[PDB]
Amino acid sequence: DAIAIVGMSGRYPGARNVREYWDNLVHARNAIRDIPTSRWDVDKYYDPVKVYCKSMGMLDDIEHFDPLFFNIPPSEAELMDPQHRIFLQEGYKAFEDAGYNARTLNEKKCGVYLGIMSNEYGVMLNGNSFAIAAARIPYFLNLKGPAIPIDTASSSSLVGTHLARQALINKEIDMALVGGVSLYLTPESYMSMAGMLSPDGQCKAFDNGANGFVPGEGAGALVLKRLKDAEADRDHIYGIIIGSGINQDGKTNGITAPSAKSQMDLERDIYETYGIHPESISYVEMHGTGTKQGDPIELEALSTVFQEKTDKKQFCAIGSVKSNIGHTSAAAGVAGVQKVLLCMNHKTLVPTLNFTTPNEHFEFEHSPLYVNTELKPWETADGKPRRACVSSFGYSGTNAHIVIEEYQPESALFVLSAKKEKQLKAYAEAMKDFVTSNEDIDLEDMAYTLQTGREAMDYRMAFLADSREMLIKALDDYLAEMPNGSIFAAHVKTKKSEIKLFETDHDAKALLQTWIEKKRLEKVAELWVKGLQIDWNKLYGEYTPRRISLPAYPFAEEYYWLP
Amino acid sequence: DAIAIVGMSGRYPGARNVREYWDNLVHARNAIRDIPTSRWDVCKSMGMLDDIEHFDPLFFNIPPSEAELMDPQHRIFLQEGYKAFEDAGYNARTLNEKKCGVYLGIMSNEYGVMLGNSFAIAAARIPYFLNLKGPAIPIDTASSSSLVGTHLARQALINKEIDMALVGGVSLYLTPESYGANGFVPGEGAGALVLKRLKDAEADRDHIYGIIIGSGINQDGKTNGITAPSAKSQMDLERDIYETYGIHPESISYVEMHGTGTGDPIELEALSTVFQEKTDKKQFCAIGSVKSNIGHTSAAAGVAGVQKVLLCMNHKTLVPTLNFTTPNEHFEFEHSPLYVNTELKPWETADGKPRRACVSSFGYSGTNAHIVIEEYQPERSALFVLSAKKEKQLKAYAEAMKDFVTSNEDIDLEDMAYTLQTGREAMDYRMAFLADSREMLIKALDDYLAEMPNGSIFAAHVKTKKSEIKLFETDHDAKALLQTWIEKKRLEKVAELWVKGLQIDWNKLYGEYTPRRISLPAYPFAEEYYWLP
């Protein structure tokens, strides 16, 4: 039936994580910049009549990777497509977002469905196949569901979502990691203009000035489970997928042109199959690429389908994050899904950009649809969960559309760890920022997530806190190296002898067990940082807190490029 | 539930089509040859396709100059995919707007680099040409690709998301750069299957090669190096399929192994262990690998193995696996359910049970597939018509038909005529004739090709005869006379008119015996050379 989204991670232009993404959306920020000479010299390719677009939504630090984290030799990292490297990182972080770690993922039947559509690095070099890109995560984490790359161009990551959903519903897998990654490394690729790109370097989605898209870069991942499992497992749930479908354009006027009729059939068939009335939908993240003949076709299709079922007018807001970040290609679907989930979580709609005058080939006034350009509350009537759709159409003519529904659910000991001390310090910084930004964080849920939803790695710190202010101060003291008697820290490999007593003696174990049961947190903390395995479940009696989303591992930022 | 395979087409080393492929398997032929300098200047061996440069772009409404810029993987699959539909007896008219998915195994980009050529487009060429409306997805899981695609198509069909699938794979080895058991020899190939729900295939009176009764896919996960196999994943994959679908290993009498000649002992042990969990019976399941004949055809490996199995079932015959002198030391056969079949022999089954077989396909990225196939057990002059887009191809079509009839002494003439009438598109160059036996049919095609006058043979180019058939298209008495003819047995008249362009309602030829579509030779494409510009 319903598929829960239980974890997410993303990296988009202007946004290193989904928190910065949300902040950028709320503030109507546009991330598109001129391409710098550190990528390639646009002057050497630019002609106005060659490339006619000089702009891109670009990711920062595409060369950065933490190969040692993944048991990969540094020299092999230079030979790996950065698409692979960046997805490996984001995919891993999505699992940590959900509160799953290597131990809890080991041997899981988790499918991996990866949207990917380009091979620039591998060519520049003359390991880098799409097959291997999709398999890196399963190899690392010892997953056992199928690992399949999907290249249906810009619908890839939504196609992958559809396949994962079907596999989950058929019980062939028990979890999925779905995602997409796109980079534009070369003037040659990004180039293919084919007439596709905007000379102004903006996706003017829905606007009469729409004249092509601006390429964008990105990487994102979602972790999916059947809703009944997610509820039994006490996952945190961002939203639910309640319908999806894929089809083809078939014969169009040129193989890259869209089909109104296919888009209508796709949407109608989904809504009929899954019993979804268009009146119940209040937002659609459109494919919305800002192409002159594409945009009106999309609007007219969707509008027509909605109007078959209702006479209600201007009840469904439409937008496209491509107006913020550009066209992120194989990652486009996952970027749109994330935007929708964030909007649902905060009960807020955010502006779509670059919209001055409606496209002349479509009349909005008598449409179910309207273009939302305002930051505003996402209102819903009565009890009802919010619902939204996401569309993603590819140049090869394979289309996808999904429907998402809002999910409506019925002293603490803080521990942190990393593979290197420098990354522990970066972790503490990330947590301090997060807590600073999130004044309402539930401290007991946060601690419980750090205890049970993160792997205990070799460099450790821990401390007690009963409030946000105390928590912030401990992290500050840790970072400033300023003495604080409630902060503990150690490198596990250095403390083996100091812990052995509690691992082998029967009365020591019984005293440790008693300590954990009577919540003697200072004692548990000192021993944990030294490497002692703590049975965290024993800390909790009648009441067990819940896993929540927290910042995920701060990878080492080591540069690797062509050998 | 069950998925029917209603069409196939294939092009492998030494075999231009599935009929030659079968002939080569029966005779234990090995297609591996030394790589010639015309490919590159030289492992010096490959299972190679012939004339990989050849394409018929005009047939596909593609400009000849575009053809040079198309990855021959795309071109060749477009041809084989099309032909699979014609094998099944479907044409552009009957496929138009069908919800048919396309799932294409493909794992290399050599041409594009040497130089439109994305995997996404490769999968979309057929849907664009035929106006298909199911999703078109390329699959790159390396050598398990075409079997992974078969699994996905099967699940979409079961879930009613599509009403037909075209599944296939294609691999070519174009560059030196991308290139007892001692490793594999690379092979080239392209193959396609057409799939439907069994209930639809029976209602539609399709011819059915076999049925898929179970499939699954999984991953190796963490192995010792990312290209190493996992015994445990292979076992879990097979066990899960057999349990999910209620399949007893005792019922299985052939397995087409992944069998790359590297890996081999892990595969044997896994499958043997799974079977032995459920049965004590010894040496009842033959194993083989067509990679011994044609090399490792990579993305196409799964489809090549499935086709071999279907062909074996259809002819109730097991064929030798090659290059086997002594068993791999790391596996003991004697007390195994499994035995290596090296004989051409009858495929025996007990008390009228359908034969069952499995096909395994494992990729270097660790995504595995396995399917289970079951044998399907089904419950006067004729008017032969042939047409092509050019006269030269019409002649090539007539030759292919004459060879087929010559080779097949038990062909049902009424089923063949029916297939030509209802299962082929009426194209601009036309011929037709009457025949009431195999001998007369062979003689008519011979006469046609030898240009010997024969009063039973008609032929025309449709664009040249327009004025001459208008008399029948619009008049109500003319339609009645035509309708009368489609009835008092004057096939000669129907034939003359058809070749000139008149649209005939073939259903009207049949009262309440209606023949059945069968497999016949498919379009003989123009063999035009296109390579790098």
DSSP assignment string, A383-414? TPPPEEEEEEE-TTSEEEEEEEE------EEE
CB A342 within 8 A of CB A21: yes
> In chain A, which residues have their Cβ closer than 8 Å to the Cβ of B135?
152, 159, 246-248, 398-399
Single out the residue of A452, A450, A457, A429 nearest to residue A529, CA to CA.
Answer: A457
Single out the residue of B299, B298, B320 nearest to residue B308, CA to CA.
Answer: B320
At residue A444, what is the residue type? Answer: E
Closest-CA residue of B relative to A122 is B113
Please give the Cα distance from A295 to A24 (Å, whole number).
24
Q: Name the helix (H) or strand (E) containing A131.
A: helix A130-141
Give the tokens for residue B440: 């007369």
> In chain A, which residues have their Cβ closer than 8 Å to the Cβ of B113?
123, 126
Q: Name the helix (H) or strand (E) containing B119.
A: helix B119-130
Judged by CB atoms closer than 8 Å, whether chains meet at A131 and B142 is answered as: yes
**Strand, coil or helix: what is A150?**
strand
Beta strands in B462-531 (DSSP E): 528-529
> In chain B, which residues have their Cβ closer than 8 Å to the Cβ of A165?
none
CA B435 to chain CA centroid, nearest Å:
29
DSSP B233-298: HHHHHHHHHHHHHT--GGG--EEE-------HHHHHHHHHHHHHTT----S-EEEE-THHHH-B-G
Judged by CB atoms closer than 8 Å, whether chains meet at A170 and B161 is answered as: no
At residue B101, what is the residue type? Answer: G
Please give the Cα distance from A163 to A157 (Å, whole number).
10
Please give the Cα distance from B57 to B70 (Å, whole number).
10
Q: Name the helix (H) or strand (E) containing A435.
A: helix A421-437
Judged by CB atoms closer than 8 Å, whether chains meet at A119 and B109 is answered as: yes
- Enter the DSSP assignment of B186: B
CB A240 within 8 A of CB A4: yes
At residue B167, what is the residue type? Answer: V
Distance from CA of A527 to the nearest CA of B (A): 32
Q: Between the CA of residue A512 and those of A506, A524, A532, B266, what are the distances in Å?
A: 10, 8, 10, 46
Give the tokens for residue B312: 């074996």
> In chain A, which residues have their Cβ closer than 8 Å to the Cβ of B223?
139
At residue A433, what is the residue type? Answer: D
Distance from CA of A344 to the nearest CA of B (A): 29
Testing the interface with B: which of A148, A171, A263, A399 to mutate, by most B Cβ within 10 A? Answer: A148
Closest-CA residue of B relative to A162 is B156
CB A182 within 8 A of CB A138: no
- Sequence length of chain A is 563
Judged by CB atoms closer than 8 Å, whether chains meet at B156 and A149 is answered as: no
Give the tokens for residue A358: 């409606």
Closest-CA residue of A relative to B217 is A146
User: At a CB cut-off of 8 Å and minimum separation 6, what does B36 contact?
Assistant: none
Number of A–B residue contacts, CB under 8 Å: 160
CB A244 within 8 A of CB A161: yes
Judged by CB atoms closer than 8 Å, whether chains meet at A135 and B99 is answered as: no
User: At a CB cut-off of 8 Å and minimum separation 6, what does B162 contact?
Assistant: B99, B100, B101, B134, B135, B153, B156
Strand-strand pairing, A387-393 and A398-405: antiparallel
Please give the Cα distance from B460 to B462 (Å, whole number).
6
Distance from CA of B360 to the nearest CA of A (A): 15
> In chain B, which residues have their Cβ closer than 8 Å to the Cβ of A139?
220-223, 226, 366
Q: What are phi and psi for residue A104, nearest 5 degrees?
A: -80, -15
Closest-CA residue of B relative to A72 is B225
Q: Between the CA of residue B508 and those of A157, A335, B512, what are the distances in Å?
A: 50, 57, 10
Strand-strand pairing, B210-219 and B367-374: antiparallel
Give the tokens for residue B92: 């552009």
Q: What is the radius of gyration, based on Cα positions, of chain A?
A: 24
Give the tokens for residue A496: 């083996």
Give the closest of B113, B135, B221 to A144, CB-based: B221
Specify burial of residue B484 (Cβ count, 10 A radius: 0-12, 13-18, 19+): exposed
Testing the interface with A: which of B219, B224, B230, B233 to mutate, by most A Cβ within 10 A? Answer: B219
Single out the residue of B383, B381, B416, B380 nearest to residue B494, CA to CA.
Answer: B383
**CA distance between the termini of chain A:** 49
DSSP H helices in B277-426:
291-294, 301-314, 391-407, 413-422
Closest-CA residue of A relative to B126 is A250
> In chain A, which residues have their Cβ closer than 8 Å to the Cβ of B177?
126
CB A117 within 8 A of CB A330: yes
Judged by CB atoms closer than 8 Å, whether chains meet at A396 and B124 is answered as: yes
At residue A357, what is the residue type? Answer: T
Ramachandran assignment for B357, one of left (phi > 0), alpha (psi -120 to 50 degrees), beta (any other): beta
Please give the Cα distance from A356 to A202 (Å, whole number).
13
Single out the residue of B508, B504, B524 nearest to residue B387, CA to CA.
Answer: B524
Taking each helix axis from N to C end, the angle separating B391-407 and B438-450, rounded to the nearest 10 degrees, works out to: 150
Q: What are phi and psi for residue B101, nearest 5 degrees?
A: -80, 155
Name the method of structure determination: X-ray
Please give the Cα distance from B500 to A454 (Å, whole number).
77
Distance from CA of A106 to the nearest CA of B (A): 9
At residue A251, what is the residue type? Answer: K
Single out the residue of A18, A91, A57 nearest to residue A555, CA to CA.
Answer: A91
CB A428 within 8 A of CB A416: yes
At residue A452, what is the residue type? Answer: T
Please give the Cα distance from A529 to B503 (Å, whole number).
85
At residue B48, what is the residue type? Answer: M
Please give the Cα distance from A151 to B117 (Å, whole number).
12
CA A237 to chain CA centroid, nearest Å:
14
Q: What are phi and psi for residue A294, nearest 5 degrees?
A: -75, -50
Closest-CA residue of A relative to B157 is A166
Count CB-CB contacts under 10 A for residue A311. 8
Cβ density class B451-467: b for 16+ within 10 Å, e for less? eeeeebbbbbebeebee
CA A298 to chain CA centroid, nearest Å:
25
> In chain B, which residues have their Cβ closer than 8 Å to the Cβ of A150?
137
Q: What are phi and psi for residue B56, nearest 5 degrees?
A: -120, 75
Q: What are phi and psi for residue B199, nearest 5 degrees?
A: -65, -40
Count CB-CB contacts under 10 A for residue A12. 30
Q: Between the CA of residue B210 and those of A397, B101, B200, B310, B374, what are the distances in Å?
A: 31, 19, 14, 6, 6
Q: What are phi and psi for residue B54, nearest 5 degrees?
A: -80, 135
Residue A372 has, within 13 A of its CA and on its CB side, a CA count of 28
Give the closest of A144, A147, A159 to B137, CB-based: A159
Please give the Cα distance from B323 to B263 (Å, whole number).
16
Closest-CA residue of B relative to A171 is B244
Specify burial of residue A45 (Cβ count, 10 A radius: 0-12, 13-18, 19+): middle
HEC-encoded secondary structure of B43-61: CCEEECCCCCCEECCHHHC
Q: Between the CA of residue B364 and those of B182, B189, B249, B285, B347, what are the distances in Å?
A: 17, 18, 27, 26, 32
Strand-strand pairing, B285-288 and B338-340: parallel
CB B237 within 8 A of CB B228: no
**Strand, coil or helix: what is A273?**
helix
Please give the Cα distance from B131 to B54 (Å, whole number).
24
Please give the Cα distance from A95 to A117 (Å, whole number).
23
Please give the Cα distance from B453 to B443 (Å, whole number).
11
Please give the Cα distance from B362 to B267 (Å, whole number).
10
Single out the residue of A268, A232, A275 nearest to residue A405, CA to CA.
Answer: A275
Please give the Cα distance from B211 to B373 (Å, whole number).
6
Please give the Cα distance from A8 to B257 (Å, whole number).
39
Closest-CA residue of B relative to A105 is B221
> In chain A, which residues have their Cβ closer than 8 Å to the Cβ of B139?
148
Give A9's strand partners. A221
DSSP H helices in A254-293:
260-274
Cβ density class B67-91: b for 16+ within 10 Å, e for less? bbebbbbbbbbbbbbbbbbbbbbbb
Judged by CB atoms closer than 8 Å, whether chains meet at B219 and A143 is answered as: yes
Testing the interface with A: which of B103, B178, B222, B232 to mutate, by most A Cβ within 10 A? Answer: B222
CB B101 within 8 A of CB B30: no
Residue at token pair 């008149």: B502
**CA distance between the termini of chain B:** 49
Distance from CA of A123 to the nearest CA of B (A): 7
Judged by CB atoms closer than 8 Å, whether chains meet at B366 and A138 is answered as: yes
**Strand, coil or helix: what is A6?**
strand
Please give the Cα distance from A376 to A349 (Å, whole number).
5
> In chain A, which residues have their Cβ closer than 8 Å to the Cβ of B130?
250-251
Domains of chain A as residue ranges with CATH: 1-444+543-563 (3.40.47.10), 445-542 (1.10.1240.100)
Single out the residue of A446, A286, A418, A271 nearest to residue A352, CA to CA.
Answer: A286
**Strand, coil or helix: what is B223?**
coil
DSSP A353-364: PS-SSB-TTS--
User: At a CB cut-off of 8 Å and minimum separation 6, what does A386 contact?
Assistant: A282, A283, A344, A347, A378, A380, A405, A406
> In chain A, which residues have their Cβ closer than 8 Å to the Cβ of B102?
248
Give the closest of A129, A141, A250 to B131, CB-based: A250
At residue A530, what is the residue type? Answer: K
> In chain B, which residues have their Cβ closer than 8 Å to the Cβ of A130?
119, 140
Give the tokens for residue A464: 């007690």
Q: Rounded to a whole number, what is the largest CA-CA distance in chain A?
A: 83
Q: Between the CA of residue B226 and those of A10, A74, A123, A133, A139, what are the distances in Å?
A: 26, 17, 22, 11, 7
Please give the Cα distance from A225 to A547 (Å, whole number).
16
- Enter the DSSP assignment of A52: S
Single out the residue of A204, A107, A92, A192 nearest to residue A137, CA to CA.
Answer: A92
Angle at B160 (CA atoms; ends B159, B162), nearest 5 degrees: 120
Give the tokens for residue A520: 């003697």
> In chain B, which residues have their Cβ closer than 8 Å to the Cβ of A129?
107, 140, 142, 365
Single out the residue of A485, A463, A467 nearest to residue A475, CA to CA.
Answer: A463
Q: What are phi and psi for residue B397, nearest 5 degrees?
A: -70, -45
> In chain A, which residues have their Cβ closer than 8 Å to the Cβ of B128?
249-252, 255, 397
Give the closest of B138, B233, B236 to A151, CB-based: B138
CB A18 within 8 A of CB A342: yes
Give the tokens for residue B136: 């078109």
